[PDB]
Amino acid sequence: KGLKNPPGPWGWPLIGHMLTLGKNPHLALSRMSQQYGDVLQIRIGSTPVVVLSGLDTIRQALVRQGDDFKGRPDLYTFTLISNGQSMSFSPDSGPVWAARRRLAQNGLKSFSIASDPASSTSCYLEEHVSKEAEVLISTLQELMAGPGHFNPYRYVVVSVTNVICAICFGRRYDHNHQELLSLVNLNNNFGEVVGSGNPADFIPILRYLPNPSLNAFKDLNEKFYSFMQKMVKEHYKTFEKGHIRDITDSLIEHCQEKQLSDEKIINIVLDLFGAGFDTVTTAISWSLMYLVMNPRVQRKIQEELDTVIGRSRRPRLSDRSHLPYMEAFILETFRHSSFVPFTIPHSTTRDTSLKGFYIPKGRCVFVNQWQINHDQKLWVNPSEFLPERFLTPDGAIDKVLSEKVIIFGMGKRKCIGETIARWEVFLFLAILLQRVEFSVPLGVKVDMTPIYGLTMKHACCEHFQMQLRS
Numbered sequence: 463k464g465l466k467n468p469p470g471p472w473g474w475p476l477i478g479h480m481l482t483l484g485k486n487p488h489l490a491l492s493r494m495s496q497q498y499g500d501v502l503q504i505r506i507g508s509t510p511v512v513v514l515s516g517l518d519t520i521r522q523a524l525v526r527q528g529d530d531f532k533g534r535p536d537l538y539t540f541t542l543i544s545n546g547q548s549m550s551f552s553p554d555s556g557p558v559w560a561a562r563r564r565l566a567q568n569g570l571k572s573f574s575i576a577s578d579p580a581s582s583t584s585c586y587l588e589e590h591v592s593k594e595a596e597v598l599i600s601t602l603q604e605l606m607a608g609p610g611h612f613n614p615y616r617y618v619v620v621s622v623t624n625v626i627c628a629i630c631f632g633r634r635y636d637h638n639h640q641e642l643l644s645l646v647n648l649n650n651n652f653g654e655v656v657g658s659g660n661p662a663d664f665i666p667i668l669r670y671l672p673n674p675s676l677n678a679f680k681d682l683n684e685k686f687y688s689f690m691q692k693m694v695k696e697h698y699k700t701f702e703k704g705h706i707r708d709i710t711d712s713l714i715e716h717c718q719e720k721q722l723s724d725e726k727i728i729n730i731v732l733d734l735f736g737a738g739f740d741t742v743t744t745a746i747s748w749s750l751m752y753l754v755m756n757p758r759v760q761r762k763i764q765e766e767l768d769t770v771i772g773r774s775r776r777p778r779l780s781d782r783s784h785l786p787y788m789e790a791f792i793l794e795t796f797r798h799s800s801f802v803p804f805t806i807p808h809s810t811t812r813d814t815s816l817k818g819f820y821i822p823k824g825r826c827v828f829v830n831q832w833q834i835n836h837d838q839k840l841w842v843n844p845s846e847f848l849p850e851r852f853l854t855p856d857g858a859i860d861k862v863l864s865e866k867v868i869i870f871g872m873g874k875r876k877c878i879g880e881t882i883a884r885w886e887v888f889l890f891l892a893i894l895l896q897r898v899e900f901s902v903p904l905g906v907k908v909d910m911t912p913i914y915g916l917t918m919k920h921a922c923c924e925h926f927q928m929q930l931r932s
């Protein structure tokens with residue numbers, strides 16, 4: 463009716479609610495939204511923060527009022543990413559950002575969904591995922607002959623990285639390549655530092671005290687930026703104007719057809735490479751954890767594969783639409799884990815209101831996806847892993863209910879690799895489960911508790927076993 467300020471609990475005058483958030487902000491703020499509602503206010507240090515919950519309220523802000531909520535706060539941790547010029551994390555939300563986003567979407571679309579000039583049956587993504595799925599199966603058979611057990615993340619992260627690495631740099635790597643493992647599987651705390659609520663972003667003194675976490679984050683980005691440099695120079699040395707091989711070339715080509723510094727056009731590939739390998743690897747890793755902890759669910763997926771395709775040919779993307787129980791499992795992996803509990807923090811571009819509450823310009827905003835995916839109002843038993851909740855009586859996907867699983871964001875800042883992620887996750891699982899069975903013996907600890915971060919990881923598990931099927 464009128465205009466109010468967003469409600470919220472009392473906080474300490476110097477540190478605010480930093481202690482209320484604790485180690486699991488997504489859980490603390492979910493309980494908090496049950497009491498104060500979909501639009502609430504807190505403080506981290508002296509910085510106010512508005513936290514958005516509820517499915518309709520978040521759609522109202524990110525979509526219907528999207529231009530008001532399309533900004534990024536000028537946090538310190540973001541200034542360390544891509545030399546302070548990250549497309550996704552810098553405070554630039556004007557036309558320069560929109561142009562870079564438009565370069566990334568077309569680069570992805572051109573080298574993921576487009577038809578491969580070599581094969582006629584499949585596209586780029588399906589070709590790459592098929593190759594790595596085979597190498598992944600062979601690599602796991604070797605481990606079953608030796609130690610008899612393995613850590614799936616150790617080898618999934620390479621297979622997933624080779625896919626995005628072929629789309630970006632036209633290269634793949636061996637599962638024991640020392641350079642790669644040092645890059646994608648050596649002290650990778652990117653998600654832990656960038657996760658919404660990092661005290662270093664709101665308590666300035668923590669940035670200058672002995673901080674091993676922040677030191678690892680600085681080294682990690684310097685290492686990734688050097689890798690970008692190496693791959694761009696190697697591409698320039700062998701660049702052919704009429705033969706665009708990957709996304710790096712389509713960006714070099716755009717630097718010649720030349721607002722956008724050379725650096726801001728090139729480092730876009732790094733945002734795609736870093737996001738492509740980290741989030742899909744975590745998604746496939748979480749999927750494997752659920753398959754092992756819910757053998758009932760693993761066999762029902764295999765039964766559908768045998769019925770709809772059989773073991774006479776490998777699965778294909780065209781079969782995704784006809785495997786509803788596979789989609790129900792992927793949707794419930796996203797929903798139950800919500801391994802992306804918050805979007806990247808947002809920021810208001812101008813004074814605005816939301817559900818009658820005033821939010822001034824420059825206000826930092828958290829978007830709680832975990833709250834949606836676990837809302838008691840929307841789901842029956844939110845804490846249980848039940849893929850059947852997305853299935854109709856006739857065995858089809860309930861389109862209305864699947865669209866209430868929020869993990870890719872909304873509006874102007876939504877994920878640009880959503881389709882790639884959904885096709886890549888589907889194919890890897892379809893090819894593997896058709897041929898192998900994953901399991902873990904009784905009596906071994908398997909900690910399913912998520913570890914907070916931008917992308918929530920699980921405790922590593924060395925007790926995975928894989929067996930061929932009958």
Ligand code: HEM
Pocket residue numbers: 549550551563570733734737738739741742745802804805806807869870871872874875876877878879880882883
């Ligand atoms: C299961 C896999 C993935 C999930 C759950 C996921 C989720 C998200 C989320 C929550 C956001 C932020 C939304 C917001 O800030 O409002 C985002 C943004 C983004 N995603 Fe994804 N993502 C996934 C995979 C990928 C892949 C495969 C790519 C590229 C190949 C990618 C590229 C990006 C980029 C570049 C952004 C930044 C958008 C911007 O800053 O404007 N992501 N993603």
Ligand SMILES: CC(C)=CCC/C(C)=C/COc1c2ccoc2cc2oc(=O)ccc12
Pocket residue numbers: 543544548550646650651652653682683686732733734735736737740741802804805806916917
């Ligand atoms: C997960 C959600 C919701 C959104 C992510 C979107 C983007 C753009 C992530 C950028 O990802 C990375 C970058 C970017 C420059 O440098 C990087 C270095 C990295 O190193 C790592 O270990 C893991 C990732 C990583």
